[PDB]
């Protein structure tokens, strides 16, 4: 049952078994009910921990593979295995988002949440993609982020943490993926400035979340400019 799967995901989170947590959350989502704010966060935590693990491993391997040139075949083969596992996790998340979550989302907050998640997992795919596939992936991430930006600019205040986190990730996408440093800097500055103008009006519930993202936008700008 759905309630059992959510309890098990909460247990897997306590035990730090994120692949189990992701599997329980996938099953819960597949029951067909809308996810609550707590459940959205369980799903996000589960898959971001799994994919974050894979991305860090991929970066290690890819770094060795590059230094190796000046090889052997083992690094390429193993990097390819990690890459395939990462691609499968991203495809799982994206499948859940497209077949269950984006369509069935009630509020604008949940829709921005899911659309940001869609751009994030397409962005993770773009980090390891190479040819014409990379171009298709870049377009799909851009499209998810843009749809989310349009909704967040119309429905959420500029200090909202979902809006801020979205603008942060989309600016990372512009800089790192789309190779548009100017769009990245511009987006990050604008987001920071618009949030700064409303700083005194920020909700107490969002104090820690929003100010953190504001610090990250500022850190990225220091790094990019």
């Amino acid at each position: 049952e759905r309630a059992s799967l959510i309890q098990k995901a909460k247990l897997a989170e306590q035990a730090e078994r994120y692949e189990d947590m992701a599997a329980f959350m996938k099953g819960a989502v597949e029951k067909g009910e809308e996810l609550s704010c707590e459940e959205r966060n369980l799903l996000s935590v589960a898959y971001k921990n799994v994919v974050g693990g894979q991305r860090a491993a991929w970066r290690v391997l890819s770094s060795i593979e590059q230094k190796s040139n000046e090889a052997g075949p083992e690094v390429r083969e193993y990097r390819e295995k990690v890459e395939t596992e990462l691609q499968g996790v991203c495809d799982t998340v994206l499948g859940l988002l497209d077949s269950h979550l984006i369509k069935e989302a009630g509020d604008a907050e949940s829709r921005v949440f899911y659309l940001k998640m869609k751009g994030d997992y397409y962005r993770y795919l773009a980090e390891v993609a190479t040819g014409d596939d990379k171009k298709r992936i870049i377009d799909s991430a851009r499209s998810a982020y843009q749809e989310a930006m349009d909704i967040s600019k119309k429905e959420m205040p500029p200090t909202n943490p979902i809006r801020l986190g979205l603008a942060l990730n989309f600016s990372v996408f512009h800089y790192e993926i789309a190779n548009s440093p100017e769009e990245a800097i511009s987006l990050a500055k604008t987001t920071f400035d618009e949030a700064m103008a409303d700083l005194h009006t920020l909700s107490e519930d969002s104090y820690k979340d929003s100010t953190l993202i504001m610090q990250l936008l500022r850190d990225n700008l220091t790094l990019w400019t």
């Binding site: 935590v45 971001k48 994030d120 979902i162 801020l164 990225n220």
Partner: peptide, 8 residues
């Protein structure tokens, strides 16, 4: 390394 949005 650049920052991306932290966990909700």
């Amino acid at each position: 390394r650049r920052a991306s949005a932290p966990l909700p």
